[PDB]
Design brief:
This is part of a larger assembly, with nine protein chains of nine kinds.
Chain B (H helix, E strand, L loop, with lengths): L2 H9 L1 H19 L3 H9 L31 H5 L1
Chain H lengths: L4 H17 L4 H21 L3 H26 L3 H24 L1 E3 L3 E3 L17 H7 L6 H21 L4
Antiparallel strand pairs in H: 1-2
Helix pairs in contact in H: 1-2, 1-4, 2-3
Chain I lengths: L28 H20 L9 H39 L24
Classes of the chains: A mainly alpha (about 350), B mainly alpha (about 80), C mainly alpha (about 140), D mainly alpha (about 100), E alpha/beta (about 325), F mainly alpha (about 60), G mainly alpha (about 50), H mainly alpha (about 170), I mainly alpha (about 120).
The complex binds cardiolipin (CDL) (3 copies), 1,2-Distearoyl-sn-glycerophosphoethanolamine (3PE) (6 copies) and adenosine monophosphate.
One cardiolipin (CDL) sits at the interface of chains I and A.
PDB class: electron transport
Keywords: complex, respiration, mitochondria, oxidoreductase
Entry title: Membrane domain of open complex I during turnover
Chain lengths: ~350, ~80, ~140, ~100, ~325, ~60, ~50, ~170, ~120
C-alpha cells in the first residue's frame, strides 16, 4: 500500500470513531460507524491472501448487519420520540436493537463468533487496531444510552462473553485467537459494570487497551503469531520474555499489577449495588483467562523450549523494528496499581 | 510557467479547458459585483406570509400599510 | 420464560406436588429447547430426522431433570414438613443429577451432576430465602 | 400506529431473516442486506414525510448514499472471494476455523 | 532507520536510480564449473557489484568486525565433514544445507538491498533459487531424510515467495568427468571424496528442474566450459537481451518500496528460517542453546547493539 | 517510641480512619438518593437543550 | 575501526540529542512556572499571603 | 379499496421481500428486489415524496441494483425456496386478515387497521414542496453532512481501488 | 455519575474552580512514583534495543522521567479536583436534604444491650 494512502485511510478510521464520539445526532453516529468500517476494510486486506479476504468478508457481514440493526433502532427511536438526539432511547425495542447492534460491533457473545476468525485472518497490526481502536466507538455509544439499556440483556451479554471468552482461549495455540477470546472476556467485564458505574467501564477499557497494545507490540516485535514461535524468544531476545511474562500476569489480573486494577474496582462497584453472586462468578470465571495466560508464560519465559540451529544467524542482527511506545506501554500495563485512585480523571 | 502551459495546451487541451473553466468557477464569484444581488433577490422573494406586528406604540420604521413609505423597498430590483 | 419461573415460585413448597412438577418440567423443557436450538444451529445434523432426534433427546433429558427435581423437592418438603429448607433442594438437585447421569448412561457424570446441581439448587433456595440478587438493579 | 409501518417493519424482518439464514451464495446475502436498507429508507421516508420534519428530508438520501457505498464494498469483497474459489459460495470461506 | 515510509514520501523513488544496467545476474554451475571467475569477469565488464558465493560465514562477513566467527556460533556445521562423512549420525548434512540456505537468503536480501538503494546491479553465485539442487542431490544420494526435504520445502515456500527472481541466470555446462578432473587438480583432500553419483545428481537437478523453471521467470544463458572462458561473448549476450519475462516488468515504486522495506530488515528476512519444526538435524536443545547464546554475547562487539560497545572503542554512549 | 507517643498517634490514626469511614457511608447514601431521585448534581443524564427551539412565526399559524 | 559496516548509532545524532535536552529543559521550566503560578493563584483565591 | 392503496402497495412490498429473501437464485433475487424497490417508491410517492421516490428509481434501482445484476451476471454465468416463500406469504396474509377483521393488531407494536390516509395533514405548503426544501437545505444547513458524505465517497473510491488490486 | 456536573462546561481538563485547590507539591510521592515509572520505561527502552541499560542515552532516560512527571502532575491535579468536586457535591446535597440525613441519637454502652456469646 502507498504510505500516503495508508495515512489517509488510518486518519479516516480515526475520523469515523471521532465522529461517533463527538456527534449529537444519531445519523452522524451511524455515519461514523459506516466511515470506520469502509476505511478499516483495506487495513485487513493489507497483505492480499485468501485468509485476509475471508476475514474481511466476515467482518463486513457482521458489521453491516449491526449497522442495519443500529439504523432500525434509530428509526424506531424517531417514531416514538420525533427526534434524533444521542441520549436515552424512547422505546425498549429500539434499546434492545441498539444493544444487540453494539454487541455485534464489539463482538460480545453470542455475537462473538467473528472475532477469533477475523483476528486470525489479518496481520498483527490490523488486529491491534481491531481489538483496541474498534471498541472505542461502540463503548461510547453504550456510554450515552445507558438510561435505556435493559439490565438483564446487558448482564446476560456480559456473563456470556466472560464465560465464552474464558473457555475459548483454553483450546488455542494461535496467539491472535488467544487475544481475541481475551478481548471477548474483557468486553464482558466492561459491560457488566456499565449500568452501575460507566467510569469503571472506561477504566477497564483503557487498561485493556494498554495491555492488549503491549501484547500485540511484543508479538510484532518478535514476529510471533503462534505459541511455539513465541517459545523461541528466549534464545533470541531474553528481555522480551520478561516483558511478555509481566504483561500476561497483568492481563490475568494478578496483584500487584495494573490489570488487577479494573476487575477489583468493578467488584468494588458491583457490591455497592448489592450484586454479590455476579462479580464472584465473574472473578472465578476469569481464572480461565489466567490459565491460558499462564500457559503462554510457561512456554515463553518460565521454561526454555528447544530452538533451531538457524537461530544462531539471528543472533548477529538487531531488531530494527520500530517498537513504538513498547517500554511506556509495558510500564503502564504492569506498574500502575499504586496509582489506582487516578481513575477519577475519567469521571 | 509559459512553456509548460503551451505544452499542456498542445498535448491536452481538454484538461486545460477543464482546469480553466473550474478556476473561473472558483475565483470569479468573489470578484463579481453582482454576487450581492443574488443574495438580495433570494431574500427579497416572499415564500411565507409576512406576519404583522402588534403596534405597541413606538415602531417608526414599521409601516401601517404596504403603500406607506417606510419599510424595505425593491426599487433596486425594478431598476438594476 | 420469566413467567415460567414465576408460576414455579408462586406455589409454596410441599403443597401442590403435581403442578410444581409440571412447572419444573416446563422450565426444563424450555431450557432443553434453547440448547437444542443452538445445537442444531452451530452443529448441522446430517438430516432432518437426526435434527429432530437431537432436539427431542435434549428436550426430554432436561425435562426429565426438571420433573424429577421438582418431584423430589416437593416430596422431601412434604415428608419432612420443612418448606423453607435448602436441604430439600439439595436432595432435588442430586435427583436431577442422577437423572442427567441416567440419560447420558454413565455413573460418574451422575455423581458429579448430583453434587454440583444439588449445591446449585441449594444456593437457589438460599437466594430465594435471603433475597440474593444475581441481576441486581443499579441503586447507587 | 399506522398500518403501512407494520408492513415496512415486516419487510425489514423478512429481509433480516433472509440475511441471517444463508443458503449458498454471498450475493443473495448482499441482496438481503440491501433489502434491509431499502426498507429502512422507506420507513424513514414515511416517518419524515408524515411528520413534516423538513430538515430530515435529506436524511434518507444520506442513508441511501452511504449504504450503496457499503454495497459497493461488499460487491468488491464478493469479487475477491469469487477470484479465489470460482464461486461466491459461503462454504468456501471456512479457512479461519483453524 | 535510513530508509522508510517517510523517505518514500519525501521523494526517494527507486525507479529514478533503476537504470538499464541495474540487473541482478546469478551465475550457476556444478562444483568446479569455473564460474567463480566468470561472475567476477561479468562484474568487471558491466560495472556490477560482485558478491562471492555465500558460505557458512557470510553473515559473519556482514556483521561485527567482518571476520569469521567460530563454527559453534555460526553454522554449527562443516562442509569438510559433509565431504568426509555424508551419511553421518549427527545430522551435519541437512544442518549444513539449512544454514547455507539461510546464508543465501541473507545474501539475496543484501543483493536486492544494494540494487534497490543504489541502482547498481549485482552478480551472485548460486542464489536461493538454485540452492535446492544440492538438497535433492543429497536426498537422491541418501545423505538426508525425506523429513529434511519437507523442512527445506516449508522454509523455502514461505521465504522465496517474498522476492523477485534474478534478471539473468548464467549456467555453465561442465560434465562430471571434467568436474572430477578439476577437483583432483584442486588438491582439497576433503573435496576429493565427492562421489560421481552426487555430482551427476547436481547436474540432473540443474538441467531437469532448475533451468526449466527459471526459463519462464527469467532469461537463462547456458555456456559450456570453453565458451564461458570468453567474458566478452557473455557480456555481449547479456547486453543484447530483450527482457520480456518475469515479475520485474510489473514493479512500480510502491512494490519496490515494499521490497526494499523487506530486504533491509534482516530479522524479517531471516524470520522463517527458524520455524518451530522439531527436526533432529536442526533442533538445538535448551541447555546447548543457552550455553552457546551466552558464549556468543561474550564475544567482542557482540554484547550490545553495534554502536554501544566500549570494549571495541565506542564513544559517546551516554548520549546515544 | 514512648507509650504516650504511640498512644496519641494511635488516636490520630483512629480519628482519621473513622472520619474516612463515615464519609464513605455518607457517600453511599448520597449516591443512592441521587440515583433514586435525580435531583442532585450527579446522575444528570442529558435532555434536549431548549435553546435549539425556533420561536419565530412559522408559515402556518397553529403551532 | 572495528566494524566492517558503519553502524547507524556509531555517532550520536546531535540534532536528536539537542532536541531531547531542549524539550526536557522546556518541560521542566514550564512545569516549575505552572506550579509557581498555581500556588500563587491558590494563595490569592484563599487569601494566604 | 382505493383508500387502502398505500397498504396494498405495502403488501406487494412484503411479498417482494419474501420473494427475494427466500433466495431462489441471485438473479431472480435481483428481480424481486427491483420489483420491491418500484413498489416502495410508489409508497413514498403516495406520501408525497416525489424526489425521494425518484431517488429510489435513479440511485437504488437504476444505479445500485444495476451494479448488483451486473456483478451477478459476471459471477453466476428449489424446495427450500418455495416452502419459505409460501411460509412468508401465509404469514403476511394472516397479518392482513387479522388487521382487517379487527382494525387493530399487535405483533410487536400496536397497529391500526384503518386506511393509512387518516394520519395526513389537512393544509398546504404554499409555493414549495417541503421535502424538496429540506433536501435543498443540505447545501445551506447540512455542511458537515456534505463534508462527511463526500469524504466517505472519496475514501470509498480509494478503498475499492485498494482491495480490488491484489497487490 | 458526575457527568452532568462537567457538562455545562465540557472538555475542560482543569476547570477554573480547580485553581481554588492547592496544587500537588513537586515532592508528591505519587509524582515521584510517576517519575520512577519514567525511569523504568527508559531502562526497558535501553534493554529492548540492547543498549547498556544504565549508561546509554541519558538524555533519553531524562526525557522519559521528565515527560512522565510532566503528564503526571496534571493528572494528579485533575484527580484531586475530581475528588474535591465529589466531596463538594456530597456536602451540598446533605446540607440541602436534612430529612434524608437526620442526626442519629448516639447511645452510650450503659444503655446499649449487646448479646454475650461465651467462647467455651
Ligand atoms: C499526554 C499523553 C502523551 C502520550 C504520548 C505521546 C507521544 C508518544 C506517541 C507518539 C510517538 O510515538 O512519538 C514518538 C515518541 C517516542 O516514542 P518511542 O519511539 O516509543 O520512544 C523510543 C525512544 O524514545 C526513541 O529514541 P530515539 O533515539 O529515536 O530518540 C530519543 C527521543 C528524542 O526525543 C525527541 O526527539 C523529542 C523532541 C522533539 C519533540 C517534538 C518537537 C516539535 O527521546 C524520547 O522520545 C524519550 C522518550 C520520551 C517519553 C515517551 C513517552 C512520553 C510520555 C507518555 C505519557 C506518560 C504518562 C504516565 C502517567 C502514569 C500515571 C497514569 O515521543 C517522542 O519522540 C517525544 C516525546 C515527548 C513527550 C512529551 C510529553 C508531554 C506532552 C505534553
Ligand atoms: C454441572 C454439573 C455436572 C454436569 C456435567 C458433567 C460433565 C459434562 C458431561 O456430561 O460430560 C459427558 C459428555 C462427554 O464427556 P466425557 O467423555 O464423559 O468426559 C468425562 C470422561 O468420561 C471421564 O470419565 P467420567 O465420566 O467417569 O468422569 C467425569 C467426572 C465425574 O467424576 C467422576 O467420575 C469421579 C468423581 C466423582 C464425581 C465428582 C464429585 C465432585 C464433588 C464436588 C467437589 C467437592 C466439594 C466438597 C464440598 C463439601 C461440602 C459440601 O465429571 C466431571 O469431570 C465433571 C465435574 C463437574 C462439572 C462441573 C464443574 C464446574 C466447576 C465450577 C466451579 C465450582 O459431555 C458432553 O457431551 C457435553 C454436554 C453434557 C451434557 C450437559 C451438561 C449437564 C448440564 C446440566 C446443568 C448444569 C448447570 C450448572 C450447575 C453447576 C454450575 C453452577
Ligand atoms: C527498575 C525496574 C525496571 C528495570 C527495567 C530494565 C531491567 C534491565 O534490563 O536490567 C538490566 C540491567 C543489567 O543488565 P546489563 O548487563 O546492563 O545488560 C542486559 C544483560 O545483558 C541481560 O542479559 P541477557 O538479556 O542476555 O540474558 C539474561 C536474561 C534473563 O532472563 C531470563 O532468562 C528469562 C526470565 C527469567 C525468569 C523470570 C524472572 C522474573 C522476571 C519478571 C519480574 C516479575 C516480578 C515483578 C513483580 C511481580 C508482578 C509480575 O534477560 C535479562 O536479564 C534481561 C534484563 C532484564 C532483567 C530484569 C527485568 C526487569 C523488567 C521487568 C520488571 C520490572 C517492571 C515490571 C514490574 C512489575 C510490578 C512491580 O539491570 C539493571 O541495571 C538494574 C537496575 C539497577 C540500578 C537501579 C537504580 C535505581 C535508581 C532510581 C532513582 C533514579 C530515578 C528517579 C525517578 C524519580 C524522579 C522524580
Ligand atoms: C477515552 C479514550 C479515548 C481514546 C484514547 C486513545 C485510544 C488509543 C487506542 C490505541 C490503538 C492503537 C492502534 C495502533 C496504531 C494505529 C495504526 C497502526 O496499526 O500502526 C502500526 C504500524 C503498522 O506497521 P505495518 O508496517 O503495518 O506492520 C506490518 C509489518 N511491517 O506500526 C507498527 O506495527 C509498529 C509496531 C508498534 C506499534 C505500537 C502502537 C501502540 C499504540 C497504542 C498505545 C497504547 C494506547 C494509548 C494509551 C492509552 C489510551 C487508552
Ligand atoms: C483549481 C480549480 C479546480 C481544480 C479541480 C477541478 C477540475 C475540474 C475538471 C475535472 C478534472 C478531473 C480529472 C483530472 C485528472 C488529472 C490527472 C491527469 O489527467 O493526468 C494525466 C495527464 C496525461 O495524460 P495521460 O495519462 O497520458 O492520459 C492519456 C492521454 N494522453 O496529465 C496531464 O495532462 C496534466 C494535467 C494537469 C495540468 C493541467 C494544467 C491546466 C492549467 C489551466 C490553466 C490554469 C487553471 C487554474 C487552476 C490551476 C490548475 C493547475
Ligand atoms: C422439534 C422440531 C425441530 C425442527 C427443526 C430442526 C430440525 C433440523 O435440524 O433440521 C435439519 C436442518 C438442515 O436441513 P438438512 O435437510 O439437514 O440439510 C441437508 C440438505 N438436504 O437444520 C436446519 O435447518 C437448522 C435450523 C433449524 C431451526 C433451528 C431452531 C428451531 C429448532 C430447535 C428448537 C425447537
Ligand atoms: C452456583 C450458582 C449459585 C446461584 C445462586 C442464585 C440465588 C438465587 C437468585 C435468584 C432467585 O431465586 O431470587 C429469588 C426471586 C424471588 O424473590 P423476589 O425478589 O420476591 O421475586 C419476585 C419478583 N416479583 O426469584 C426470582 O427473582 C425469579 C426466580 C429465579 C430463579 C433462578 C434459577 C432458575 C432456574 C435456572 C435458570
Ligand atoms: C424463527 C425465525 C424464522 C421464521 C421463519 C422461517 C421461514 C422458513 C424457513 C425455515 C428453515 C427452512 C430451511 O431449510 O432453512 C435453511 C435454509 C438455508 O439452507 P439451504 O442450504 O438452502 O437448505 C439445506 C437445508 N438446511 O434457510 C433459508 O433459506 C431461510 C430463508 C428465510 C427467509 C425469510 C422469509 C420469510 C419468513 C417468514 C417471515 C419471517
Ligand atoms: C493523557 C492526558 C491528555 C489530556 C489532554 C487534554 C484532554 C482534555 O482536555 O480532556 C477533557 C476531559 C474532560 O472532559 P469531559 O467533557 O468531562 O469528558 C467526558 C467524557 N466522558 O478530560 C479527560 O477526559 C481527562 C482524562 C483522560 C485520560 C486518558 C488516559 C488515561
Ligand atoms: N550440499 C552441498 N555440497 C557441496 N557443496 C556445496 C553444497 N551446498 C553449497 N555448496 C558450495 O558449493 C561450492 C562448490 O562450488 P565452487 O564455489 O565453484 O567450488 C562448495 O565449496 C560449497 O561452498
Amino acid at each position: 500500500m502507498n504510505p500516503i494512502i495508508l495515512i489517509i485511510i488510518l486518519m479516516t478510521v480515526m475520523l469515523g470513531t471521532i465522529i461517533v464520539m463527538i456527534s449529537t445526532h444519531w445519523l452522524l453516529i451511524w455515519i461514523g460507524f459506516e466511515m470506520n468500517m469502509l476505511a478499516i476494510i483495506p487495513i485487513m486486506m493489507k497483505k492480499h491472501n485468501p485468509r485476509a479476504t475471508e476475514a474481511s468478508t466476515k467482518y463486513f457481514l457482521t458489521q453491516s448487519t449491526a449497522s442495519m440493526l443500529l439504523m432500525m433502532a434509530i428509526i424506531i427511536n424517531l417514531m416514538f420520540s420525533g427526534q434524533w438526539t444521542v441520549m436515552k432511547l424512547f422505546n425498549p425495542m429500539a434499546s434492545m436493537l441498539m444493544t444487540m447492534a453494539l454487541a455485534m460491533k464489539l463482538g460480545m457473545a453470542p455475537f462473538h463468533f467473528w472475532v477469533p476468525e477475523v483476528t486470525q485472518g489479518i496481520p498483527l497490526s490490523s488486529g491491534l487496531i481491531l481489538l483496541t481502536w474498534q471498541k472505542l466507538a461502540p463503548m461510547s455509544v453504550l456510554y450515552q444510552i445507558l438510561p435505556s439499556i435493559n439490565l438483564d440483556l446487558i448482564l446476560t451479554l456480559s456473563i456470556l462473553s466472560i464465560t465464552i471468552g474464558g473457555w475459548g482461549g483454553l483450546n488455542q495455540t494461535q496467539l491472535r485467537k488467544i487475544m481475541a477470546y481475551s478481548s471477548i472476556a474483557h468486553m464482558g467485564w466492561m459491560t457488566a459494570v456499565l449500568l452501575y458505574n460507566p467510569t469503571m467501564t472506561l477504566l477497564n477499557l483503557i487498561i485493556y487497551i494498554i495491555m492488549t497494545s503491549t501484547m500485540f507490540t511484543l508479538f510484532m516485535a518478535n514476529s510471533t503469531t503462534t505459541t511455539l514461535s513465541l517459545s523461541h524468544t528466549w534464545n533470541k531476545a531474553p528481555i522480551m520474555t520478561i516483558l511478555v511474562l509481566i504483561t500476561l500476569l497483568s492481563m490475568g489480573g494478578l496483584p500487584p499489577l495494573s490489570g488487577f486494577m479494573p476487575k477489583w474496582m468493578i467488584i468494588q462497584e458491583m457490591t455497592k449495588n448489592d450484586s454479590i453472586i455476579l462479580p464472584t462468578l465473574m472473578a472465578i470465571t476469569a481464572l480461565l483467562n489466567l490459565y491460558f495466560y499462564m500457559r503462554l508464560t510457561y512456554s515463553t519465559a518460565l521454561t526454555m523450549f528447544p530452538s533451531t540451529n538457524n537461530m544462531k544467524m539471528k543472533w548477529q542482527f538487531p531488531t530494527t523494528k520500530r517498537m513504538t511506545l513498547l517500554p511506556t506501554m509495558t510500564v503502564l500495563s504492569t506498574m500502575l496499581l499504586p496509582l489506582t485512585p487516578i481513575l477519577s480523571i475519567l469521571e | 510557467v509559459a512553456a509548460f502551459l503551451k505544452n499542456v495546451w498542445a498535448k491536452e487541451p481538454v484538461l486545460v479547458a477543464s482546469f480553466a473553466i473550474a478556476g473561473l468557477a472558483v475565483i470569479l464569484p468573489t470578484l463579481s459585483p453582482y454576487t450581492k444581488y443574488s443574495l438580495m433577490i433570494n431574500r427579497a422573494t416572499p415564500y411565507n406570509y409576512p406576519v404583522p406586528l402588534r403596534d405597541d406604540g413606538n415602531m417608526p420604521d414599521v409601516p401601517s400599510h404596504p403603500q406607506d413609505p417606510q419599510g424595505p423597498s425593491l426599487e433596486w430590483l425594478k431598476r438594476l | 420464560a420469566k413467567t415460567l419461573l414465576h408460576q414455579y415460585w408462586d406455589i409454596p413448597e410441599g403443597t401442590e406436588c403435581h403442578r410444581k412438577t409440571y412447572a419444573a418440567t416446563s422450565i426444563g423443557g424450555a431450557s432443553g429447547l434453547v440448547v437444542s436450538a443452538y445445537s442444531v444451529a452451530l452443529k448441522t445434523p446430517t438430516s432432518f430426522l437426526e435434527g429432530v432426534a437431537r432436539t427431542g433427546r435434549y428436550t426430554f433429558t432436561a425435562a426429565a431433570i426438571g420433573a424429577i427435581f421438582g418431584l423430589t423437592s416437593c416430596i422431601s418438603a412434604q415428608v419432612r414438613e420443612k418448606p423453607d429448607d435448602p436441604l430439600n433442594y439439595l436432595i432435588g438437585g442430586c435427583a436431577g443429577g442422577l437423572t442427567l447421569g441416567a440419560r447420558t448412561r454413565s455413573y460418574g457424570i451422575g455423581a458429579a451432576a448430583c453434587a454440583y446441581m444439588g449445591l446449585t439448587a441449594a444456593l437457589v433456595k438460599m437466594g430465594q430465602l435471603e433475597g440474593w440478587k444475581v441481576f441486581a438493579e443499579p441503586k447507587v | 400506529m399506522s398500518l403501512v409501518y407494520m408492513n415496512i417493519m415486516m419487510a425489514f424482518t423478512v429481509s433480516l431473516t433472509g440475511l441471517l439464514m444463508y443458503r449458498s451464495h454471498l450475493m443473495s446475502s448482499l441482496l438481503c442486506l440491501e433489502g434491509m436498507m431499502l426498507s429502512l429508507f422507506i420507513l424513514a421516508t414515511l416517518m419524515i414525510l408524515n411528520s413534516h420534519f423538513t430538515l430530515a428530508s435529506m436524511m434518507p438520501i444520506i442513508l441511501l448514499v452511504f449504504a450503496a457505498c457499503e454495497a459497493a464494498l461488499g460487491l468488491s469483497l464478493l469479487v475477491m472471494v469469487s477470484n479465489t474459489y470460482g464461486t461466491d459460495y459461503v462454504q468456501n470461506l471456512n479457512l479461519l476455523q483453524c | 532507520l535510513q530508509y522508510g515510509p517517510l523517505a518514500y514520501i519525501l521523494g526517494e523513488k527507486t525507479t529514478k536510480k533503476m537504470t538499464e544496467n541495474s540487473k541482478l545476474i546469478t551465475v550457476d554451475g556444478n562444483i568446479c564449473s569455473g564460474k567463480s571467475k566468470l561472475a567476477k569477469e561479468v562484474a568487471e565488464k558491466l560495472g556490477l557489484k560482485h558478491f562471492p558465493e555465500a558460505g557458512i560465514h557470510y553473515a559473519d562477513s556482514t556483521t561485527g568486525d567482518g571476520k569469521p566467527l567460530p563454527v559453534r556460533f555460526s553454522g554449527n556445521c562443516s562442509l569438510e565433514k559433509f565431504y568426509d562423512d555424508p551419511k553421518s549420525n549427527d545430522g551435519n548434512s541437512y544442518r549444513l544445507q539449512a544454514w547455507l540456505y539461510a546464508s543465501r537468503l541473507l545474501q539475496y536480501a543484501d543483493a536486492l538491498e544494494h540494487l534497490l538503494s543504489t541502482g547498481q546491479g549485482v552478480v551472485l553465485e548460486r542464489s536461493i533459487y538454485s540452492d535446492f539442487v544440492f538438497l535433492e542431490a543429497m536426498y537422491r544420494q541418501g545423505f538426508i531424510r525425506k523429513q529434511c526435504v519437507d523442512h527445506y520445502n516449508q522454509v523455502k515456500k514461505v521465504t522465496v515467495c517474498e522476492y523477485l527472481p534474478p534478471h539473468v541466470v548464467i549456467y555453465v555446462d561442465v560434465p562430471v568427468s571434467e568436474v572430477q578432473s578439476r577437483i583432483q587438480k584442486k588438491g582439497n583432500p576433503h573435496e576429493m571424496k565427492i562421489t560421481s553419483a552426487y555430482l551427476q545428481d547436481i547436474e540432473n537437478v540443474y538441467k531437469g528442474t532448475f533451468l526449466p523453471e527459471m526459463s519462464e521467470k527469467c532469461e537463462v544463458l547456458q555456456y559450456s566450459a570453453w565458451e564461458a572462458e570468453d567474458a566478452e561473448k557473455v557480456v555481449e549476450d547479456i547486453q543484447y537481451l530483450k527482457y520480456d519475462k518475469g515479475p520485474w516488468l510489473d514493479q512500480d515504486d510502491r512494490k519496490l518500496h515494499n521490497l526494499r522495506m523487506l530486504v533491509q530488515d534482516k530479522l524479517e528476512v531471516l524470520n522463517y528460517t527458524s520455524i518451530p519444526v522439531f527436526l533432529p538435524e536442526v533442533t538445538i536443545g535448551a541447555h546447548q542453546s543457552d550455553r552457546v547464546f551466552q558464549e556468543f554475547t561474550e564475544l567482542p562487539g557482540r554484547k550490545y547493539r553495534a554502536g554501544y560497545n566500549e570494549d571495541v572503542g565506542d564513544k559517546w554512549i551516554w548520549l546515544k | 517510641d514512648a507509650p504516650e507517643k504511640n498512644y496519641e498517634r494511635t488516636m490520630a490514626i483512629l480519628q482519621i480512619e473513622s472520619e474516612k469511614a463515615e464519609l464513605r457511608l455518607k457517600e453511599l447514601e448520597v449516591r443512592r438518593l441521587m440515583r433514586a431521585k435525580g435531583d442532585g448534581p450527579w446522575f444528570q443524564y442529558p435532555t434536549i437543550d431548549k435553546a435549539l427551539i425556533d420561536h419565530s412565526p412559522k408559515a402556518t399559524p397553529d403551532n | 575501526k572495528f566494524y566492517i559496516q558503519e553502524p547507524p548509532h556509531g555517532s550520536p545524532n546531535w540534532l536528536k540529542v539537542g532536541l531531547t535536552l531542549g524539550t526536557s529543559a522546556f518541560l521542566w521550566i514550564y512545569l516549575i512556572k505552572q506550579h509557581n503560578e498555581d500556588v500563587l493563584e491558590y494563595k490569592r483565591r484563599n487569601g494566604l499571603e | 379499496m382505493m383508500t387502502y392503496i398505500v397498504f396494498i402497495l405495502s403488501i406487494i412490498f412484503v411479498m417482494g421481500f419474501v420473494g427475494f429473501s427466500s433466495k431462489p437464485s441471485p438473479i431472480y433475487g435481483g428481480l424481486g428486489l427491483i420489483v420491491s424497490g418500484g413498489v416502495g417508491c410508489g409508497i413514498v410517492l403516495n406520501f408525497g415524496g416525489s424526489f425521494l421516490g425518484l431517488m429510489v428509481f435513479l440511485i437504488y434501482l437504476g444505479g445500485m441494483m444495476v451494479v448488483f445484476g451486473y456483478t451477478t451476471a459476471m459471477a453466476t454465468e428449489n424446495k427450500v425456496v418455495l416452502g419459505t416463500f409460501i411460509t412468508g406469504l401465509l404469514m403476511e396474509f394472516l397479518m392482513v386478515y387479522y388487521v382487517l377483521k379487527d382494525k387493530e393488531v399487535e405483533i410487536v407494536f400496536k397497529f391500526n387497521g384503518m386506511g393509512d390516509w387518516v394520519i395526513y395533514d389537512t393544509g398546504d405548503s404554499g409555493f414549495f414542496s417541503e421535502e424538496a426544501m429540506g433536501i435543498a437545505a443540505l447545501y445551506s444547513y447540512g455542511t458537515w453532512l456534505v463534508i462527511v458524505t463526500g469524504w466517505s465517497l472519496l475514501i470509498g473510491v480509494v478503498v475499492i481501488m485498494e482491495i480490488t488490486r491484489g497487490n | 455519575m458526575m457527568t452532568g456536573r462537567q457538562a455545562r462546561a465540557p472538555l475542560q481538563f482543569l476547570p477554573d474552580e480547580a485553581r481554588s485547590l492547592p496544587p500537588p507539591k513537586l515532592t508528591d510521592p505519587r509524582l515521584a512514583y510517576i517519575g520512577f515509572l519514567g525511569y523504568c520505561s527508559g531502562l526497558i527502552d535501553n534493554a529492548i534495543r540492547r543498549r547498556p541499560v544504565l549508561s546509554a542515552g541519558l538524555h533519553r532516560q531524562f526525557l522519559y522521567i521528565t515527560s512522565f512527571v510532566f503528564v503526571g502532575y496534571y493528572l494528579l491535579k485533575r484527580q484531586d479536583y475530581m475528588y474535591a468536586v465529589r466531596d463538594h457535591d456530597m456536602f451540598s446535597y446533605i446540607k440541602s436534604h436534612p430529612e434524608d440525613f437526620p442526626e442519629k441519637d448516639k447511645k452510650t454502652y450503659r444503655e446499649v444491650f449487646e448479646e454475650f456469646h461465651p467462647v467455651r
